Amino acid sequence: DGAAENVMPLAETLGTEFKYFTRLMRRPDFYRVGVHTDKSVEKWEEIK
Amino acid sequence: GGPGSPVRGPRGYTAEWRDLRNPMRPPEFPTPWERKYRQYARGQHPSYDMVYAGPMPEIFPMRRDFRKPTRWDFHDIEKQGKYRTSGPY
Amino acid sequence: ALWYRATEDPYFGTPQHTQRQAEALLKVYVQAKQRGKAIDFMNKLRGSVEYLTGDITITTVMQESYDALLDTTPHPHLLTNGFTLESDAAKYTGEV
Amino acid sequence: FRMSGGDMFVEYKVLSRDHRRSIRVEDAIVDPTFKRTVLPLGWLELLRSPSLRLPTGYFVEETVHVSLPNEANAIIAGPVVLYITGQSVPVVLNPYFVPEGTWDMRTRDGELDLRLGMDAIEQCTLFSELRPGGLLYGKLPENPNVRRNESLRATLGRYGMKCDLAESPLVPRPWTRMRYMFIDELQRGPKLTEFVGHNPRNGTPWRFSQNTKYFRIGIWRDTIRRNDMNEGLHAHSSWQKSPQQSVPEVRFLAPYP
Amino acid sequence: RLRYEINEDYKVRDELGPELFALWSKAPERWPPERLSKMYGLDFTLVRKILVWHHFKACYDACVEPDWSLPKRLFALEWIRDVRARKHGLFYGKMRFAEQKITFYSDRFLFRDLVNRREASYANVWEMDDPYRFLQTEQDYEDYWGDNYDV
Amino acid sequence: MEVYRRITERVRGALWAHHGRLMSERQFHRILAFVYNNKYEYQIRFDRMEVVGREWGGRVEVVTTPAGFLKRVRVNPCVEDLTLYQQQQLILSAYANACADGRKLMEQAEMNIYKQFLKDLKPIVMGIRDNPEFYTVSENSIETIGGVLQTGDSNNLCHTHRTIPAAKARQPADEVRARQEWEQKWINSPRGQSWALTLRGKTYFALHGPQYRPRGAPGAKKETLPLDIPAPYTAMDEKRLLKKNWMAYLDNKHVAEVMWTRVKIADREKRQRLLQETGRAWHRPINEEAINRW
Amino acid sequence: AKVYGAVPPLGAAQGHRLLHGKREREGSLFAVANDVKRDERLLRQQLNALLEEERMPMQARLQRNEAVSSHEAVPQTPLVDLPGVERRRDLPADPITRLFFQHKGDHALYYGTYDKPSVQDDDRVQIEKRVPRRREENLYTPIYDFCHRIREATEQRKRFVVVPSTIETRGCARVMHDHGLVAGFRDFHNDRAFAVELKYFQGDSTINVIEPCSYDGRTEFEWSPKMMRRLLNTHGIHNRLVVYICRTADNRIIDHIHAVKENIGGRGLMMVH
Amino acid sequence: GGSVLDRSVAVPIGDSTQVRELFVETKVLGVEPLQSPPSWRTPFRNDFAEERLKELQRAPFKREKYVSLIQGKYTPKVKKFGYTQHTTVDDFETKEYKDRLLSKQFFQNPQAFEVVPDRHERSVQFGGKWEYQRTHGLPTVDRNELENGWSEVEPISDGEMKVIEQALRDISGPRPGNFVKPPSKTKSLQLSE
Amino acid sequence: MGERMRAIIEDYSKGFGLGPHGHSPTHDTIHYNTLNAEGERVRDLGYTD
Amino acid sequence: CAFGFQHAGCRINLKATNNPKSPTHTVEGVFEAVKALRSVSEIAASRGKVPHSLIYNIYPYLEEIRRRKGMMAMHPPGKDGLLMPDRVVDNRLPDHLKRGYYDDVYWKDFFAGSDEHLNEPRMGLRGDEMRRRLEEAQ
Amino acid sequence: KNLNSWYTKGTMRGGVPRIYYAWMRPGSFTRRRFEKMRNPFVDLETGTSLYFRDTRDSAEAIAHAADSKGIKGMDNAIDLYNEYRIVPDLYPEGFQWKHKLNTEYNQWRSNTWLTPDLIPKEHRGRFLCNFQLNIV
Amino acid sequence: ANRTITGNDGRFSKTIMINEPQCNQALSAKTASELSKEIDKATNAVYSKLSVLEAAQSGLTDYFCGGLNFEIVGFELHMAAMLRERAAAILERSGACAMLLEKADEREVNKLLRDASRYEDRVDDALRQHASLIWRVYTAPRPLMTLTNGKCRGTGCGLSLFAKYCALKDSSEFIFDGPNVGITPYGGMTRLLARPETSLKYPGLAEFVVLTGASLFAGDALRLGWTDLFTTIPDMTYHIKEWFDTTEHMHNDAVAWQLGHLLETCFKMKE
Amino acid sequence: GLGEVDDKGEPKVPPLQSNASVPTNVSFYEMARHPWEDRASSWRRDGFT
């Protein structure tokens, strides 16, 4: 809601983040493509 | 029987693999182990050692120990003379 | 001490106290002119397990010797059977 | 320990000697008609823990006759340790292990009809329940020594009783038996503990008094010239210049006066 | 000359009435030393000492005899430390400070036990603090009762 | 423990701050001890019952006492085929759900405990603020050697509240006596007659008659007037100490003072935090004349 | 009468050997003898098993339980990983403000010996090997000199010492840092040297005295387990104050207390308290 | 008694005759087991007749004045807290408890109960040297009653809470004399020294 | 005799609670009544209606 | 023995015939030695380690680590324990009000000789009590 | 085993007495400055905001997810009378009782009070003890 | 065992330094489950007044902590998928925990599948161990001060900001990102971003940082009141060590003052 | 069939229920009350006879 009460505490926030992380990491998007996205330049040099 | 004693010497699964069993699964015949013992046996029972023992207090105080007359306590300097008394007792 | 050692000893001991041991002890107390101990012991006895089981009993002989000694030795607050009147206590009491 | 139907129900824990193996019993009758407490034979093998001191699980294993319910129909085995919920002291049984044939107590579903005998009551605070006025008195086996229906004050009257507790002004009141309680840390502090001898355990707490041979010349010198300091062995004496004498149980940490 | 006393907050006079004697009288089992010891702002050895004295005063007051094994039960750890010391250095008495071992533990030495305690769980509270959890092997049961030739 | 110790120290310190009374260490710890034993009793009774958490579908069932002790685990044979890792996580998360339910119950119980505790402090607390001499000044009002200065701003914003009736004293005792007068008034009337024969009536007399408790039955056997401990009018632990030894006087005095100070500092911290959260206060001192210019 | 801990509770087929009392089989003296012996020995065997369970070290026990804990039905094959995560990492050190450069363990081919060191840390001075100028003189050990360096740098209240780097030397360092006689230490895989950091307390050192066991390398002192056990005992009280340090037949550098623990005898190095 | 355990004993209502001639309405709720009434609702195990008689024989004494036989005495005698002499509160003490207690007290020493007391000295004891194990402490209450039988707690509302902690945060506001102590309140020091 | 006297007096007369600057009178770095700054502040104001 | 040593033993100069030996030397030596002695507790603190003898003190801590599970690990929901002041309360009264204030609770003239509780200490006092005051004044 | 037998140690010196301790050294006995809070630490006040670090989050200290509410552990005083003593006591409290003057304590318990010239200033009223003198 | 986590102890102080300069301080599953052990071993120690956690960086790396290693995670997720692919392939070659009519194929299908699930279990484990480590830091019994020197990716953000003493040097930084790597942010900082406080002071900032991967720094962590403490002093760690060496008793008054004085003099900003 | 639903929706192998409820008679303050006056407080007062 945004009320000082309705915000999730730390325990539920980690669990929630986990729910989302777990569900997204399956999709080829993350593991097949985005993980290699941030590699350095000479990393990509060596791989190519 | 120690370190000076004569030495004792020495893909798939072995016959030692089978007998073994996960403690999560219920065992063979349900021998009623006391929970406390199986805690201690497995190393997870909270220690009470002699290291956690402080001073052993005097609770009920004994008695007044009254002065017991010795041979060095005499109201005359005689009887303590060198020809009689070698020491207090 | 003997009375404790009678149930304590593994080899020569009885599991519970026999009658014999009870009247023997009581007889000793009587024969020592030991008053307080005789009383307490008697009461303790009838408070025991052996007594409620029926194993140990108070007999007539124990009872009457107990009473005899009760009579013949000084009681703290009162005068007792077997207190000999002193003729000369009139010096203080005033009565002969 | 609770009451129903006129009798006692106690929870207890049976245990091997090494306390390796254990069984809880929830509601056990406490019935003092049993010379010795009876268990089912099925447990004999459950409670057997073969330690180093007892290579076989038990010290004593025998056959006996003992048909109370209802020629060797049972087994005496022990020792076995028994913790009753009420009591601080373990009670060590050597119980009758009875097979199903000799006596079978299945009596109500799930209910094994166990009870506790005088084997175990003699060793408890439960024993105090066996004396006149207690809750086990009714169920004692009939004797010349125990009268069934007499009121308590009647019986106690017959023994010693006259009045209520400490009712006569001649007998002191029970609670003045102890007035002061001595705890060093809440009052006056710890003792100053010295010794003369070999150890603290081998000697006396006492120093030697002034009447000693070697102390007299010194103590003299101290009585005469009091203000100057004086050599001697007269120091080691229980007597000295200072108002505070050395004798045992000086409380030296005291904020006195 | 006897005027003053250390520690004025607990007076010997006021421990004459024993605390909550109307409760632990009636089921002395459900009342381990902990429940009471939350009462005193003192340290451990002193407060168990005091609890012993309470039990004794109380018993003498109700005209019954006190449990003499209570000082063994509250001080149990000390009892066994002493039995075993006496066994080791051969002497009869109470082990005092000069005779303690000179071992120096690391700072985190207590960790194993600390996670064992923090994670322990108990079916009921009696199991939590019973008097005898100090004991596991038979040796322990032998040293804790050597004195009663009964037990 | 903690929440309680904070409040008790609030009470002790306030007791010496406002009037010259000291609370005996004995007393201070015995309050706490009662909170503790309360909790303990709640634990005693809480272990007689069980809580059931469940994971996937109903496939994984975990039975656990609210304290968190694990009792039984029922499992579908479907689980047996997973992996030890996933079996572990599954039972673990069931266990977590049990702990959730148990801990919900528990927290209700705790709220109950807090309430009984407050009720038990109330004769003391009220006891200090319900006196003809008790007063406070606003916290933002400057204080100088003679006395306290007026805070200038918004002459409307400052309202002095008064707890006490200014005419002749009406104490809580009088109110409880009023209550039992209306109890007897209702009872003794017709229509209070027919009500006392109802189930509502016998419920009321079940719970709130003490006078009918048979001898030896647990609980209070009379109805009690509320406790009266007027703070400035009752000497407590300072009188005994001041007679016996001055040193312990000065030390107990000291403690009460220090506790008071500590409490006040905490209240300043919470104030500060609440002030930063709403963004009226910065995160580092920007105003040093509010500190250095004294 | 509810019973917890026995579900079956009464076995019907089960009755004791003495109670059922089947008529005793008559064995020939051969039978009776063989049975008395085999069961005597299975009692011997049992007694052994119990004694081993008693004497098992805690480490062994813990290992046992989290071994059984993780155990699955099939003995699963290892999973292929990243090219490696398994290189022992290189201990962190600062390049700029430094005693010595922390040398990579990947350069292991470059390294020399204590005797013939490969060129590294050119900007620091190099410690020299200490050797006799003539015959009667003692033959020094990089233990002797290790100890006297530490001693002297403790006297001048220095915070760091550079010290000779051989095996039993950094062994001794680890032992001392265990017992908390030394603030810390590092080997940079420098060949000649490594560096120790000294600890002070209350104005003076944490080290009263530190002495080598042997003045020469030509003298080698052997410590029996009983001797090392004597050190521990101060007239009946167990005393771990002073630390004595050993080589083992196994090339480990140990204190005397672990040694006594497992009853191994070892060669003396030094003593420090 | 407010409680779950507090239900009464078995009581007579007459034959079918007087029962149809007693109850007008009857409404039933499903069967559940019998709880044996607690010890304090049980009339035969609780009977106080002897102590009631003791009260009555002393009843005329209760109607006269209180007068000190030390004349010149005014100040009241202090009775301290927790002393066993002054305890009025029985929680579980029935006739049952009082007799169990009586007997244990009597076999402790008999000479407490004699109007003229004989010499009381300790003699031996039949249980052993450790007999205290089978004797000591006070008679124990049955645990079912200890735990379950307690009155229902009158529910505390949130209103009374809100008020109490209001009063709590009223007393935590500052008093004007504490920070800088007036020179006027620091003259007031007296010691018994 | 003097030092004991001073000790008692300084202890009984010490202030506590929080002053206008938010801190105790014994606080480490921040102070109250510097060079009788409050004494003078009362001097020139005076307490009157 | 002057120090109270039971278990110490001490030797001066190997053989007792070794120079220098003076009574001065014999005293000053043992005093030197004893002055160089390090106590064990001090040694243990020196290395940053806990002495075996002192560990018992951690026991109550470690104890209620173990005993904290459930219901004693519980803190009341919503309640921190720090209750900030908000309003300003003053119950003080003019004196003629607090003269007759308590007289149905306690006795009349409750505030009589009370100087802090009254701005007028002498009110309500009957004459002779007022006289007592000036009487000890002179 | 050890055969050294703590029972039999020690040497009899004849009449010469000596002190021994039942448990700890007597200076270490009364700990009152940490008990009654007489130490500078408490007065400087500086670090007392740290009892309340939990306040640094408002919505948490209400909701009690984390069990550490306090400086050393679960809460501010779990213990407070025991734990701190695990540090070896280097600088023990000693004798604090002020009910008499130093000179009156000294006078009563020490012979040294009779010889005020033989004692240097720093030790003047400081001894509670009797001193033997031995002229070598 | 791995020389990943190294430490330096004084009398009363404890320094735990994460050493992984190669991965930019990204903690592996094992190394995190390890750090939870070192952190609370150091935190439940008897003589620790303060336990300081920081990044040991030999000048190779400026990160204080990375997140989970995304290289590892991505790798084994990819392997897991590959095995689902082969298993599916032969499941469709026979079709043209998977129970079949054919023993050979049931066999190797179930082998492949079981292994896939093992990989995924290692990922799962990594996430669990990180989250639990964060919890460890949050619930530490004795004071744990996190000296944050250099950058943090998500779960590293979590590791630094939730210690009850979190100091920021200037170099400290927070990158909560990862929709940029095609994933949702992890590390708990989400709570901090959604506190009603942050909505008050910086409305819209929460979405700014969650959507756009964008760094936050010392100043903004301070203004949001995420942490209270800040310092410009070189090598604070040494000074903390040697300050707590001169410190004396263990009574919580002494501790309170010592810690508090240290905080007031350096980490709280005055003058 | 622990979580496995049946044909018409009923549970196969009926699921386990929790008996836990907040006990309502448990206030400690009336368990240990004042030794003579019956008030439920923790307040120690020394009365007069």
Ligand SMILES: [Mg+2]
């Ligand atoms: Mg372990």
Ligand SMILES: [Mg+2]
């Ligand atoms: Mg010569």
